Design an enzyme around this catalytic site. Structure first.
Site, PDB file in Angstrom:
ATOM      1  CB  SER A 151      -1.676  14.278 -13.427  1.00 25.40           C
ATOM      2  OG  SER A 151      -1.914  13.761 -14.776  1.00 25.40           O
ATOM      3  CG  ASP A 207      -2.090   1.175   0.883  1.00 23.38           C
ATOM      4  OD1 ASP A 207      -1.745   1.658   0.558  1.00 23.38           O
ATOM      5  OD2 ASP A 207      -2.345   1.269   2.178  1.00 23.38           O
TER       6      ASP A 207
HETATM    7  C1  LIG Z   1     -12.484   7.526  -1.265  1.00 24.03           C
HETATM    8  C2  LIG Z   1     -11.445   6.698  -1.291  1.00 24.03           C
HETATM    9  C3  LIG Z   1     -12.879   4.891  -1.413  1.00 24.03           C
HETATM   10  C4  LIG Z   1     -11.603   4.093  -0.931  1.00 24.03           C
HETATM   11  C5  LIG Z   1     -10.612   4.089  -0.330  1.00 24.03           C
HETATM   12  N1  LIG Z   1      -9.699   2.442  -0.152  1.00 24.03           N
HETATM   13  C6  LIG Z   1      -9.210   1.897   1.027  1.00 24.03           C
HETATM   14  O1  LIG Z   1      -9.064   2.909   2.142  1.00 24.03           O
HETATM   15  C7  LIG Z   1      -8.676   1.000   0.514  1.00 24.03           C
HETATM   16  N2  LIG Z   1      -7.964   1.126   1.538  1.00 24.03           N
HETATM   17  C8  LIG Z   1      -7.433   0.400   2.873  1.00 24.03           C
HETATM   18  C9  LIG Z   1      -6.551   0.135   2.843  1.00 24.03           C
HETATM   19  N3  LIG Z   1      -5.100   0.754   2.418  1.00 24.03           N
HETATM   20  C10 LIG Z   1      -6.097   1.191   1.239  1.00 24.03           C
HETATM   21  C11 LIG Z   1      -9.641   5.491  -0.280  1.00 24.03           C
HETATM   22  C12 LIG Z   1     -10.968   6.272  -0.630  1.00 24.03           C
END
Ligand SMILES: C[C@H]1CC[C@H](NC(=O)Cn2ccnc2)CC1
EC number: 3.4.23.22
Length: 330
Positions: free
Chosen positions: A199, A35
């Site tokens: 970007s 991650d």
């Molecule tokens: C609005 C989004 C919704 C999805 C979110 N995804 C995460 O949190 C996944 N994650 C778990 C641990 N490290 C990463 C990111 C924000």
């Protein structure tokens, strides 16, 4: 030194990727979610509340001759998806793809939230953002990359995520056979602890490129591509029947659609995400409404170049004194 490990989608939608990691002596192999948007290495363990473990492989520090309790240390993390975990901390030997770090902080979960329990394929997370985000208290700990860096042939790691296929994380070297053309490097701000970059714009399908600065993070731990509402609306307007659904929680589209590609700029270079990469399948089993892979970042507070974007590229996380990011087509 270097390391090289294969990373494998957890399911048919590439909802996340797992990479085997050796912890302890003798080795205990756990499949971790690498991650680049967080900075804690935490694992399901023999200390995890029993009712919160459902099929995961656990780390048992008492079976590791090199494990040492990091006295007084605790950790607690919440992620953007609302999930969370917490516990105490050991140091132990951790190896990834042949690269070994001794004395790595291994954060042992005492508690995990329901989504972690419910996902049997992910045994923990290995954070690769900057160590300033690490949650260990009272003494903040370093990431695996931060600990390994001085030993590496070059202070870099690379992400080469596959579309519906395995890919590779390399540490300490750039595999020049793994990409086409040249790698375009771009500036990073570490001020928020992320691999944050800007970007240079976007295009939808065969449309003209719009030059516009989009600040966001390169985040292997986020599945989808989260961009400003203006950009996302422009994309989905090219898909007949697509709409933003408050009840589902984002843009959905008819599963019968052929999705256009999406291009993002890296300096003067361009990375093209094929339309298929943007299909996350039926919203519920048997539905003809499909979930989109490009979603609005409005209310997140940051744009996120998650797996949908990163898997279209070979991505260099350059941890030199002044960090940078590199992107190549592949
Ligand atoms: C609005 C989004 C919704 C999805 C979110 N995804 C995460 O949190 C996944 N994650 C778990 C641990 N490290 C990463 C990111 C924000």
């Amino acid at each position: 030194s270097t390391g090289s490990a294969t990373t494998t989608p957890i399911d048919s939608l590439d909802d996340a990727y797992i990479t085997p990691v050796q912890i302890g002596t003798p080795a205990q192999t756990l499949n971790l979610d690498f991650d680049t948007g967080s900075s804690d290495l935490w694992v399901f363990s023999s200390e995890t509340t029993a009712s919160e473990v459902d099929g995961q492989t656990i780390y048992t520090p008492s079976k590791s001759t090199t494990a040492k309790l990091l006295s007084g240390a605790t950790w607690s993390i919440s992620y953007g998806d609302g999930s969370s975990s917490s516990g105490d901390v050991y140091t132990d030997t951790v190896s990834v793809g042949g690269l070994t770090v001794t004395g790595q902080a291994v954060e042992s979960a005492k508690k995990v939230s329901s989504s972690f329990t419910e996902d049997s394929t992910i045994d923990g997370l290995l954070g690769l953002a900057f160590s300033t985000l690490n949650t260990v208290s009272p003494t903040q700990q370093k990431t695996f990359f931060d600990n390994a860096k001085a030993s590496l042939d070059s202070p870099v790691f690379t992400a080469d995520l596959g579309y519906h296929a395995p890919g590779t994380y390399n540490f300490g070297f750039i595999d020049t056979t793994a990409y086409t053309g040249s790698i375009t490097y771009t500036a990073v701000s570490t001020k928020q602890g992320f691999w944050e970059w800007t970007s240079t714009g976007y295009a939808v399908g065969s449309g003209t490129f719009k030059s516009t600065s989009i600040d966001g993070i390169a985040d292997t731990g986020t599945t989808l591509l989260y961009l400003p509402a203006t950009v996302v609306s422009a994309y989905w307007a090219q898909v007949s029947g697509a709409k933003s659904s408050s009840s589902v929680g984002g843009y959905v589209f008819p599963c019968s659609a052929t999705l256009p590609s999406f291009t993002f700029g890296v300096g003067s270079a361009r990375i093209v995400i094929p339309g298929d990469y943007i299909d996350f399948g039926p919203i519920s089993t048997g539905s003809s409404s499909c979930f989109g892979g490009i979603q609005s970042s409005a209310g997140i507070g940051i744009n996120i170049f998650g797996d949908v974007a990163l898997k279209a590229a070979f991505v260099v996380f350059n941890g030199a004194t002044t960090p940078t990011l590199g992107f190549a087509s592949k």
